[model samples]
Target: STGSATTTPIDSLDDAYITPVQIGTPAQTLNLDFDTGSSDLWVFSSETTASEVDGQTIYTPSKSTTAKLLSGATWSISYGDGSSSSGDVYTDTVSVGGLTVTGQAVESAKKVSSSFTEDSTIDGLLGLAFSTLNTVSPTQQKTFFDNAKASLDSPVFTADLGYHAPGTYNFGFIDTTAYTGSITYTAVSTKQGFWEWTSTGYAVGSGTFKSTSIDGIADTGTTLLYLPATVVSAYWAQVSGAKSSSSVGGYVFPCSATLPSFTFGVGSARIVIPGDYIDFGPISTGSSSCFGGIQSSAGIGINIFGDVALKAAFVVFNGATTPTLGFASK
Candidate 1:
């Protein structure tokens, strides 16, 4: 059945935006990060080492009558920030919003990195990336979307992430009321299991939009916008007190600096990222320095239009042929 649902952001931008998902027979609810960058529906579970479990909740498959072990199957995953998790698998019913998929692979974590164990608010991740990236060994598992796509009214999903606010992720339907004007469409290359696209180019402040083809991924799971060092330096140069600080990482500017807005082009459609949002708040509590939301993506080797950029527009993640991306002003 076609479905839609809202996701609420936890804490501020540093935390994440999570959607409630139910797993197993009786269905245990967990607030999962709907990540477009990875494929693996893994969670903190009863199988997780007690030492690694902190304030996060865990799923108990033993309590669910419908849970069936996918014997000998295992899965592991690592994030861009160096966090990681791995576990065995279980076949069970999985539901998001009002959509349900029976016999979905539910990876139960036996181990989690320090970064994940410390972030108690995030229970796990719901992979929205192509199932081909699934880490299940011997045989890969399909994502919830992959299992449910054939039944959807339209093979599409929409992301409306807000800064420290609630947002909605609609499946099989796009809500026209959520965005303004027309959506600019661009082709996506899922070669890396990401919604990768070539941005026509970007402009620093009100500067002219350069025509360089910058490859990028629309990642909801990532907190900041990351670009090439050259592009990042150019933007930071426009700020009065902005300077690259190796200690604090990336560029930091005076908390009160009046910053210029950034803009990008997608097939003739211009989407502007406000200066305030790019400020990314202060480097630390009570500090006069504020870290830039846009930084160099040298670590990942490609530009990333993370939450800082995605939250600026209403994004459409299409599952049709070639998986096109549609963006519009919100």
Candidate 2:
């Protein structure tokens, strides 16, 4: 029962929301992943009584007093794995670090498929990306940020996650002090908002961008930098001098090296990511092709910089058509 001393707090419309999270069950409590890429919290809802929600785990709003529902709101989320879930939007008591997001949105997806089933081990995703990326109340034209806007610590929220091993996920909170350097700012675009959005682009290691002006999508869901061949090859050329071994699938010669920090001047915001994170870790297991996370993503281009780049900097996502975005060291 003894855990975090202080719970996280969220506020909106002058009201502060702080709540603790239910990390485990009688046997074990799993720490859920906080995804800034997606926009909905999808714990299994017991009352999500629909054929579509057959396989998904459900959370009970009634179990918590602060839980509130948004009437007439609908939600649906689709993943690259070809799985999707659709459901009504409901509000219920939600807690994180002893802070409660009173009346937070929950999407009880009715339709569940294979990928959704496999991800069942996870309680649900805690989206930290942006309000525009929010899909639960999209039809309602509302955002979780709108609901908890006033409570944000800074105009920016950072996700300092650690996936070292098991048990580490227990203390899930961004150490504010870790954001030591500077915070960069960029404007988000107003368009068909999707999670895999770049708004800005960067060379994985130390290499000139193929084109200075390129639209990039910042995604945390998928790993690896899926870049155009031109960009990828340019990066490889710099590090290819002494190929150690393919870092992941595409990287060659050199499993471990310090990735040069790539900086982007986004209007007023400047973002920097040390190459170490971008450089793929060796296949910890017996597999050579499968690098830890970073590697060369073949057949796909346009630069899909995965979690490696995301964790290095704090990204500001704007869901506007000409969405402006910014990044800074945290």
Candidate 3:
């Protein structure tokens, strides 16, 4: 079987992508960030603290006839940005698009950070990474994709993220019409529990491609692209009036500055990210300085090919025994 769902950007900056998911037997629908950076299908629910709740939908497990408490099970997760959520676990009927998975582990949020409360558009997160990263204690739970893979026509899922536009997430099969050209496949390292892969190199605008092996993870949850300091510096240097600012955090440039495109290699194929997409809006309302969509990974330990990069190509998270990732132009 196969399923397809539309994912829309939450804001002008395309900070995150959200997809509607049906939880419980009665099917309470909530918008969830389908994150490929982590594994743990968690949601804001009736169990969450009242004060922490904002204008967001909450999942009520008790209202579902098919809901069953996973006794003694709990989960907690923290993102790189320090946003976190933790709560008890429940197994219930969950559906995305038309795909259904019975007895799926649904982590009900009892506590959430202020960042989550401020974002009214996102009700929760649906992790698509490997199950090894699941934060559930005592018994780690498989992700929705993992649970549904057995019944699917093929063990694969694809992400077609857009910049300021609606995209799609497809389970079990690839949509040929969504992309152009032949796909370039690469080996994925699941040891880190992420969709980690290495890029052959990169180029600043129309410059020559450098043959550097840059290892990074394909993270749809993150807002920006992070690469080695050297690579980041090279790209920013091409933009006039661009500089790394500690006070503002990350590289920022004059709002009117001319920006250049960024290109990264996937085997023999190269995907280009347009300059407009790299100009991540204004740093503040009415501010003349704008933050860059790409930053340095110096302190991050690992580089991240986040939404800034993912939006440039059609990504395939192949779930074969020996997993691989595929990238294609769109």
Candidate 4:
């Protein structure tokens, strides 16, 4: 059967996009972040420490007769930004936008880091990556998408993330009206549990397209677009007063700086990210310094095409035989 869902983007916090999903027998609704970068469906639950509970909703498995504990199995995960969550395992019926998967393993959080605890808006993450990356002991777990894909007409999902606006996450089928122009497809390598692809090159501004092949993953969970330091330096140099600020932990520039567009090569198509999209946000409340959304991924050793770059264009995560990615202008 064909199905899909529209994801909601939280105001002020454009970093992560979330969707409402149902869990358990009575179906406790929770806001989950669809992360293509990882493969674990984890949530804040009753097992979480009372002190760790903030304004976020917690899943109470005991209340659901269908919930079954996965004895002797546990999971723990940490992210690139130092945020983390750990929990015990439970098998229950998980549903997203009418697509239900029975016996799907859900990690019920018992401990969370300050980054996760501080942001009470997000309840959990619904990982869309390959199930091979699921962090469960004894036996690996399958993500909601993994369990739901077999019944889908096509093993594909689309991520149409918008800038400071609500977008959609279409499953099993593509919405032709969601994008303009033709889509450029690129082969993906899922060897790392990521939608990894190679970018032919990019242009600093409206300049000629360069030939620097950059390999990176299209990560919706990541907030910013991280490129190599050489590319980051070149793009920021066009704007005067832009420098790498240790205090800000990335590149920073004058808030008033009129930036230029950055274009990337994907297949024969060139997707351009408007300059306004690159200026993430202000660094401080009263300061004129604004943080650059495009940063150096040299430290991480792998480049990430985060929301900053993703919001500028329509992205298609195709899970066909080879796992290809399609890009188009929105």
Give lDDT per model, in order: 0.88, 0.46, 0.95, 0.88
Runs of candidate 3 with Cα error greater than 4 angstroms are: none
After superposition, which runs of candidate 4 have C-alpha atoms over 4 Å from their true positions?
A: none
Q: What is the C-alpha RMSD of each candidate to the true structure, in Å?
A: 1.3, 8.4, 0.6, 1.2
**Candidates sorted by TM-score, best first:** 3, 4, 1, 2
TM-scores, one per candidate: 0.97, 0.63, 0.99, 0.97
**The candidate that achieves the highest lDDT relative to the unseen native structure:** 3
1-330: candidate 3 lDDT, tens digit per residue: 899999999998899999999999789999999999999999999999999999999999889999999999999999999999999999999999899999999999999999999999999999999999999999999999999999889999999999899999999999999999989999999999999999999999989999999999999999999999999999999998999999989999999987899999999999999998898878889999999999999999999999999999999999989999999999
lDDT of 1 by residue, 233-282 (tens): 88999999799899997889999898898887788888898888787777
Q: Taking the tens digit of each residue's C-alpha lDDT, what string does model 4 give over 1-330?
A: 565777777656487888888999999999998998999999999999888889998899999989999999999998888889998999999888777889999899999998888878899999988888999987898877778888877888889987778888878888899999988999899889889999999998878888878999999899889999998998999999999998889999999999988988897788899898888668878889989989999879899999888888889888877789999998
Number of clashes in model 1? 0
For model 2, the superposed segments whose C-alpha errors exceed 4 Å read 1-31, 47-58, 65-74, 129-141, 151-154, 161-176, 194-211, 238-275, 279-285, 292-305, 315-325
lDDT of 2 by residue, 181-253 (tens): 6655554443535434343445544555422544455665554445555555555556534232543335543
| Candidate 4 lDDT trough over 10 residues, lowest sum | 4-13
| Candidate 2 weakest ten by summed lDDT | 9-18
